[PDB]
Design a protein around this ligand. Structure first.
Ligand SMILES: Nc1ncnc2c1ncn2[C@@H]1O[C@H](COP(=O)(O)OP(=O)(O)O)[C@@H](O)[C@H]1O
Ligand SMILES: Nc1ncnc2c1ncn2[C@@H]1O[C@H](COP(=O)(O)OP(=O)(O)O)[C@@H](O)[C@H]1O
Ligand SMILES: [Mg+2]
Ligand SMILES: [Mg+2]
Lengths: 309, 309
C-alpha cells in the first residue's frame, strides 16, 4: 500500500444543485470511489477545493453586509468552507466505509497554509473574487484598502494574490493522525492563507494542488494523486488528434508543456505540482486521473497519467 | 498537570463589534489566560460556543437565499462556525503561546456529536434560532413539520431541539491528539448534531457544556472547567442576600438546584454538567468560574466554584 495525498477538485462535488443536500449526495458518490483505494490497502491523506462553495459564501457576506453583520474576510471564509466541506466529506466517507464494512477513523483538521510576504504575487494580485461591483462601490472599496480591477464590460471586481505555499502549519498534527492510521482531510481550498511566524491571516487564494504537493512533501507521502475531471491528461486535448498520456516522465511533460498542451489555470497547475513532487525526493510518484477512473484500477494499482522522474 | 476540558463561552469572544478582526482580538485576550493554565502544566482540551457567530451566519444564509445560492441548513452552518471560530482561536492561541515561548501545537478537529432520535427534546424543541420571519412565512415553513414560535412584536422564529449527546464521533481522534501533547479545539458550538447509523445531520443545538462534559468523560479528563461570565456561581443571585459558592459538594448543588437558584438556559446546564462529571468517575473535579478569575490561581490551582464529591 502507498501513503498518498489525494487532491480532490470540482468533480468531487459535481451537483449543479448548490444545496447542501445535493453536494453531500455528490460527496457520497465521491467517497464510494475513495473507499476502493482503502479496500486496496492505501493510506489516504485527503484535500479538496472550495471554488463554488467559497464563491457562494462570499456572495452571502455581501448580501447581508452591515455594521451589525459585517462581511467576513476571505481567510475566514476559507476556514468556514473547510468546515462545511470537511463535514460533508468526512461524513460521506464514514458512510461509505461503513457500507463496505471497513472500520477506519476520518477527521478534518482546519489548515493554515503559510506563504511568503515577499512573494511576487503580493505586489501583483491577479485572482478575481467576490461579486462585480460598480465603479462607485469599487472606489469606496479602494479607499478601504482593497484592490479592484474593472473587467471591461462586466464591472469591477476585487483581486487578491495567489502566492506559493511554503509550509503547512498543522503538518505535524496531520502526520500524527497519519501514523495512527486515521484518514485526514486537510488543506481545504488550498488552506487558510497566513503570513509569518505569527500566522497573520491574509486575503489570498492558494492553489490547492500546490498546497497538496507541499503537504505531500511534509508528510513524506509516497504519491500525490490529483483527481480531476479527466481520466488522463492529454496532448491536443479536445482536438481530433487528442492522445491520452499514461506513464510519463518529467522530461516528456516539460516538452509537452512548452508546446502549450496544458491549459493555464486548469491543467497546468496540476502538471507543475506533479513534476515538483516527483523532483522533490527520489522514488516519488504523482498521478493525475479521475475518481471514476479508479474503477479501472488493476489490483491496488491506480491507472491514469502516472508521473515518475 | 491535569488533563482538563476548558469550555469557553460568550465572554471568550468579547468584542465591541461583530467583525472577524474584533472577535479575533477578543480571542487573543482569552488565549492569554489559557496560556496561564498551560504554563502551570495543565493539558488543555478546549471547546467553545457559537451563538452570535452562527446567528449572523444564519442571517447571511437568508439574505442571499435563492435557487443558485440556497441557505445552508443549521448543521452545515454549525460546521462553518467550527471552522471560523476554530481558526480564530487556534491562531490566537498560537500567537500567545509563541509570546510565552511555549512550543505547543494547536489543532481544530471538526466534531460531529451524536444524539438519540428518541430524545425528549425532539418532541418539545425549546431553542429559538435564526431570522425573525412574518407569520405567513412561518406558516409555510411549518408545513413539513418544523416548529416556529412567535416572539410577540419581533416576528416568528424556528425553534429547534436541545438533545443530549450520546457520543462524540471524533473522540478517539481527539484523544489521540491529546496523548501526543497537542492542544485540541473541538465540540465547537456543542458539535455538529447528527443521528443514526449514517450520522445524518439534524437541526438542533446541543448544549456546549453537556457536549464538553461528554468529551471530558470520553478522553478521561481530570477536570471539566467551564469559563463563563461570573467568577463564582451564586445562590440568591442578584439579591441582597446573594452568596458566592466556592467549594461545594454535589449534594449541596442538588439542593440549591431544586431551590431554583440556577437560571435555566444559562447557568443551569453548567451546574448539571458539573454534577454529571463529578459523579461520572472517582477523582473527577468540575469548576465554574471566569477567564478573568484565572488571575487569582493559587499556583496551578484554579479558584472559583469547585465541585467535588
Ligand atoms: N491537456 C489537458 N489534458 C486533460 N485535461 C485538460 C488539459 N488541458 C486542460 N484540461 C482541463 O483541465 C480540467 C481540470 O482542471 P480544473 O477544471 O481546474 O479542475 P479541478 O477542479 O479538478 O481543479 C480538466 O477536467 C480539463 O477540462
Ligand atoms: N445562580 C447564578 N449564579 C451565577 N451566575 C448566574 C446564576 N444564574 C444565572 N447566572 C448567569 O448565568 C451566566 C452564564 O451563562 P451564560 O450567560 O449562558 O454564559 P456562557 O456564554 O458562558 O454560556 C452568568 O454569567 C450569569 O449572568
Ligand atoms: Mg482547478
Ligand atoms: Mg450559555
Amino acid at each position: 500500500g502507498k501513503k498518498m495525498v489525494v487532491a480532490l477538485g470540482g468533480n468531487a462535488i459535481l451537483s449543479n444543485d448548490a444545496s447542501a443536500h445535493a453536494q453531500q449526495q455528490a460527496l457520497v458518490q465521491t467517497s464510494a470511489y475513495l473507499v476502493h483505494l482503502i479496500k486496496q490497502g492505501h493510506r489516504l491523506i485527503v484535500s479538496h477545493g472550495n471554488g463554488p462553495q467559497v464563491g457562494n459564501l462570499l456572495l452571502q457576506q455581501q448580501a447581508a453586509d452591515s455594521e451589525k453583520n459585517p462581511a467576513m474576510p476571505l481567510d475566514t471564509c476559507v476556514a468556514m468552507t473547510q468546515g462545511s466541506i470537511g463535514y460533508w466529506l468526512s461524513n460521506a466517507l464514514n458512510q461509505e466505509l461503513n457500507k463496505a464494512g471497513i472500520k477506519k477513523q476520518v477527521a478534518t483538521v482546519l489548515t493554515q497554509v503559510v506563504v511568503d510576504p515577499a512573494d511576487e504575487a503580493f505586489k501583483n494580485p491577479t485572482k478575481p473574487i467576490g461579486p462585480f461591483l460598480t465603479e462607485a462601490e469599487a472606489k469606496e472599496a479602494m479607499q478601504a484598502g482593497a484592490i479592484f480591477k474593472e473587467d471591461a464590460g462586466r464591472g469591477w471586481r476585487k483581486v487578491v494574490p495567489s502566492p506559493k505555499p511554503i509550509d503547512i502549519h498543522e503538518a505535524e498534527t496531520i502526520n500524527t493522525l497519519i501514523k495512527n492510521d486515521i484518514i485526514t482531510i486537510s488543506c481545504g481550498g488550498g488552506g487558510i492563507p497566513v503570513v509569518g511566524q505569527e500566522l497573520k491571516g491574509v486575503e489570498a487564494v492558494i492553489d490547492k494542488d500546490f498546497a497538496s504537493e507541499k503537504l505531500a512533501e511534509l508528510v513524506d507521502a509516497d504519491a500525490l494523486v490529483i483527481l480531476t475531471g479527466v481520466d488522463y491528461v492529454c496532448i491536443n486535448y479536445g482536438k481530433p488528434d487528442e492522445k491520452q498520456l499514461t506513464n510519463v516522465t518529467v522530461a516528456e511533460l516539460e516538452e509537452y508543456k512548452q508546446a502549450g498542451h496544458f491549459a493555464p489555470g486548469s491543467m497546468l497547475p496540476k502538471i507543475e505540482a506533479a513534476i515538483q513532487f516527483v523532483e522533490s525526493q527520489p522514488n516519488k510518484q504523482a498521478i493525475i486521473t479521475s475518481l471514476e477512473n479508479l474503477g479501472s484500477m488493476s489490483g491496488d494499482e491506480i491507472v491514469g497519467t502516472v508521473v515518475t522522474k
